[PDB]
Design an enzyme around this catalytic site. Structure first.
Site, short mmCIF file in Angstrom:
data_model
loop_
_atom_site.label_atom_id
_atom_site.label_comp_id
_atom_site.label_asym_id
_atom_site.label_seq_id
_atom_site.Cartn_x
_atom_site.Cartn_y
_atom_site.Cartn_z
N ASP A 32 13.69 10.43 -0.17
CA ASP A 32 13.98 10.24 -1.59
C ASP A 32 14.95 11.29 -2.15
O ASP A 32 14.55 12.42 -2.42
CB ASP A 32 12.67 10.28 -2.39
CG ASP A 32 12.88 10.01 -3.86
OD1 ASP A 32 13.96 9.51 -4.24
OD2 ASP A 32 11.95 10.29 -4.65
N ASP A 215 20.35 7.84 -5.58
CA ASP A 215 18.90 7.91 -5.47
C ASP A 215 18.38 6.92 -4.42
O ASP A 215 18.24 5.73 -4.69
CB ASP A 215 18.28 7.59 -6.84
CG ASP A 215 16.77 7.74 -6.84
OD1 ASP A 215 16.19 8.01 -5.77
OD2 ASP A 215 16.17 7.58 -7.93
C1 LIG Z 1 10.88 1.61 -3.42
C2 LIG Z 1 9.96 1.01 -4.50
N1 LIG Z 1 10.64 0.63 -5.76
C3 LIG Z 1 11.01 -0.63 -6.09
C4 LIG Z 1 11.64 -0.67 -7.34
C5 LIG Z 1 11.67 0.72 -7.82
C6 LIG Z 1 12.16 1.37 -8.99
C7 LIG Z 1 12.00 2.79 -9.12
C8 LIG Z 1 11.37 3.55 -8.10
C9 LIG Z 1 11.22 4.98 -8.29
O1 LIG Z 1 10.81 5.49 -9.34
N2 LIG Z 1 11.57 5.74 -7.21
C10 LIG Z 1 11.14 7.14 -7.07
C11 LIG Z 1 10.49 7.35 -5.67
C12 LIG Z 1 9.43 6.30 -5.35
C13 LIG Z 1 9.48 5.59 -4.12
C14 LIG Z 1 8.50 4.61 -3.80
C15 LIG Z 1 7.45 4.33 -4.71
C16 LIG Z 1 7.38 5.03 -5.94
C17 LIG Z 1 8.36 6.01 -6.26
C18 LIG Z 1 12.37 8.05 -7.26
O2 LIG Z 1 12.04 9.38 -6.94
O3 LIG Z 1 13.40 7.63 -6.40
C19 LIG Z 1 12.79 8.09 -8.72
N3 LIG Z 1 13.95 8.92 -9.03
C20 LIG Z 1 14.34 9.04 -10.44
C21 LIG Z 1 14.69 7.67 -11.06
C22 LIG Z 1 15.15 7.81 -12.53
O4 LIG Z 1 16.23 8.76 -12.60
C23 LIG Z 1 15.95 10.07 -12.10
C24 LIG Z 1 15.55 9.98 -10.61
C25 LIG Z 1 10.88 2.90 -6.94
C26 LIG Z 1 11.02 1.51 -6.78
N4 LIG Z 1 12.78 0.70 -10.05
C27 LIG Z 1 12.49 1.07 -11.44
S1 LIG Z 1 13.80 -0.55 -9.73
O5 LIG Z 1 14.58 -0.21 -8.57
O6 LIG Z 1 14.51 -0.83 -10.94
C28 LIG Z 1 12.79 -1.96 -9.35
C29 LIG Z 1 12.16 -1.98 -7.96
#
Ligand SMILES: CCn1cc2c3c(cc(C(=O)N[C@@H](Cc4ccccc4)C(O)(O)CNC4CCOCC4)cc31)N(C)S(=O)(=O)CC2
Length: 372
Positions: A32, A215
């Site tokens: 991540d 990201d």
């Molecule tokens: C992989 C699972 N997953 C699927 C979706 C989606 C999604 C967002 C996130 C999400 O918040 N990713 C986390 C890590 C994480 C990985 C797996 C599960 C939970 C969290 C992060 O660390 O990377 C955020 N980084 C921040 C984002 C905002 O700006 C500052 C950095 C995950 C998503 N979305 C909100 S989406 O892409 O629009 C819809 C689908």
């Protein structure tokens, strides 16, 4: 030996194998670049196949401090500690690193995803509880001779994380670099957006309200509302030979076609122009519909091919997620404060169009596109 060391499922992140503790406990850890905490499941959870057992590690040290980390999707809380960490299919080294032992979580772990933890590869500035909690990659660099850089080739899915260097067998053509504007997230500047070659015609600061980042932990291309609305309007217009429900463009509904008949050619290419290393120069990365229309595997619907629209709205600025990184080789050159992009060996393309990284482009407009 580091090639093809990433696995995952579409839309659920990419993970690398790691071990923690002594003796080593093997866990799959999501990569991540959009966070900075290293955290692993450390108690039973319905969606965890396994978890970190601190009581079984002689090298575990409790820091006697709790931590809470919210993401856009999901959140968890846990106990901070330190322990020995290795990466079996990465550099053959052992490092002592901070680890958050996740003991409670909400909508974080994903039913059948195959990973049990998360590796935040961004900078200390955004680590929780604060920037004194040194991130894993910083610990890796300080304690070993590994160069201060890593690269990600994201392509059931697979890919490669090359730690400490650049693997030329993983990309073709030129590597183009955009500056890391600030070291917290991997923040970059978008100077221009085109949809099938047509400029969205927007003050470029709008593209970076209030930050733009790369990201790997977020699936979608997420855009500020004003940009999202303009892009959807343009994609609708290009694809107007077919009409889809409003819910599709909102990511609330799938679109399906009989198997093998997906009309790729009615959907436009999207070009994101990123700030170059030289004043008023840029390069563009071009995204095909095969990237931003994300396949949803489901045997029940398998007479068809179905997709989710993987561009969505953000209130915290642009997030260039996995669907943008896919098919590109992305070099996180921390040592030189820059991000490199090239066409990867698993690039996306059909017989008419291809993902691309190309430049230089010049603008006469002297405005800085950074929002702050
Ligand atoms: C992989 C699972 N997953 C699927 C979706 C989606 C999604 C967002 C996130 C999400 O918040 N990713 C986390 C890590 C994480 C990985 C797996 C599960 C939970 C969290 C992060 O660390 O990377 C955020 N980084 C921040 C984002 C905002 O700006 C500052 C950095 C995950 C998503 N979305 C909100 S989406 O892409 O629009 C819809 C689908």
């Amino acid at each position: 030996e580091m090639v093809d060391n990433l696995r995952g499922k579409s839309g659920q992140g990419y993970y690398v194998e790691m071990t923690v503790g002594s003796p080593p406990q093997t866990l799959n850890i999501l990569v991540d670049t959009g966070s900075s905490n290293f955290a692993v499941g450390a108690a039973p959870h319905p969606f965890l196949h396994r978890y970190y057992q601190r009581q079984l590690s002689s090298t575990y040290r409790d820091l006697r401090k709790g931590v809470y980390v919210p993401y856009t999707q999901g959140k968890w809380e846990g106990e901070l500690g330190t322990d020995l960490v290795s990466i079996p299919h990465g550099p053959q080294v052992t490092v002592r690193a901070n680890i958050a032992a996740i003991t409670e979580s909400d909508k974080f772990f994903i039913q059948g995803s195959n990973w049990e933890g998360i590796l935040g590869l961004a900078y200390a500035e955004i680590a929780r509880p604060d920037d004194s909690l040194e991130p894993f990659f910083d610990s890796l660099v300080k304690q070993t001779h590994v160069p201060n850089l890593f690269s990600l080739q994201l392509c059931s899915v697979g890919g490669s994380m090359i730690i400490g260097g650049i693997d030329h067998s993983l990309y073709t053509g030129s590597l183009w670099y955009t500056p890391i504007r600030r070291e917290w997230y991997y923040e970059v500047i978008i100077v221009r957006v085109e949809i099938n070659g047509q400029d969205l015609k927007m003050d470029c600061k709008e593209y970076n309200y209030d930050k733009s980042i790369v990201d790997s932990g977020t699936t979608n291309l997420r855009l500020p509302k004003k940009v999202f609305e303009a892009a959807v309007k343009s994609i609708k217009a290009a694809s107007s030979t077919e009409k889809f429900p409003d819910g599709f463009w909102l990511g609330e509904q799938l679109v399906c076609w009989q198997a093998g008949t997906t009309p790729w050619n009615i959907f436009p290419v999207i070009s994101l122009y990123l700030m170059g290393e030289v004043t008023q120069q840029s390069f563009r990365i071009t995204i095909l519909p095969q990237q931003y229309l994300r396949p949803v595997e489901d045997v029940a619907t398998s007479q068809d091919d179905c997709y989710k629209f993987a561009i969505s709205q953000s209130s915290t600025g642009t997030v260039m997620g996995a669907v943008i990184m896919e098919g590109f080789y992305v070099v996180f050159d921390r040592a030189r404060k820059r991000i490199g992009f090239a066409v990867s060996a698993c690039h996306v393309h059909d017989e008419f169009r291809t993902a691309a990284v190309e430049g230089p482009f010049v603008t006469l407009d002297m405005e800085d596109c950074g929002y702050n």
